[PDB]
Amino acid sequence: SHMSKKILIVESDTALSATLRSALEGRGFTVDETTDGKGSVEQIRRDRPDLVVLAVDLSAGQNGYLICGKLKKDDDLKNVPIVIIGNPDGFAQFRKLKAHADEYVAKPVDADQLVERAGALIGFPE
Ligand SMILES: [Cl-]
């Protein structure tokens, strides 16, 4: 009963992104990943994932709160669901801002909670 549902993981912890990618693929999602936080907004514009998993603390001084802020202010990208993963200390503050994520999963992330959250936002694919 499979139907295509695409996820992009923006994460420079590539061990974690591999773990999450495998877990999501196990439920039938089509999954890509990138370490390129700087390019991520434009990659989302190009590739049009159905959901993005976005880390807070990215390489090269990139920051998932800033990236999500940009996505949510972009009239053509602000409807893409975003799950932020990271140190949970900042999540409540982010929720109070106008431009914020759709869901949050604390690091250390359990791949099951992340898969659960993705499925609850866009449905499973099969
Ligand atoms: Cl992080």
Numbering used by the authors: -1 to 124
Provide passages from the article that reported this PDB entry.
To test whether the environment of Tyr102 is important for domain function, we mutated His92, which forms a hydrogen bond to the buried Tyr102 hydroxyl group in the FrzS RD structure, to a phenylalanine. The His92Phe mutation blocked social motility to the same extent as the Tyr102Ala mutation with no effect on protein stability. The His92Phe mutant crystallized in a distinct monoclinic space group (P21), with one crystal contact within 4 Å of the α4-β5-α5 output face, as quantified by the Crystal Contacts Analysis Server. In total, the intermolecular contact area decreased from an average of 4806 Å2/RD-monomer in the hexagonal crystals to 1594 Å2/monomer in the monoclinic His92Phe RD crystals. The His92Phe replacement was expected to cause the Tyr102 side chain to switch to the outward facing rotamer due to the increased volume of Phe and the loss of the hydrogen bond between Tyr102 and the His92 side chains. Unexpectedly, Tyr102 remained facing inward in the structure of the His92Phe variant, and the Phe92 side chain shifted away from Tyr102. The overall Cα RMSD for the His92Phe variant and hexagonal wild-type RD structures was 0.35 Å. In summary, the His92Phe RD structure is nearly identical to the hexagonal wild-type RD structure in both the dynamic β3-α3 loop and the output face of the RD. The similarly inactivating His92Phe mutation, however, preserved the conformation of Tyr102 in the crystal structure of the mutant protein. Rather, the His92Phe mutation may compromise an alternative conformation of the α4-β5-α5 face or interrupt a signalling pathway required to switch the conformation of Tyr102 and to retain FrzS at the leading pole during S-motility.
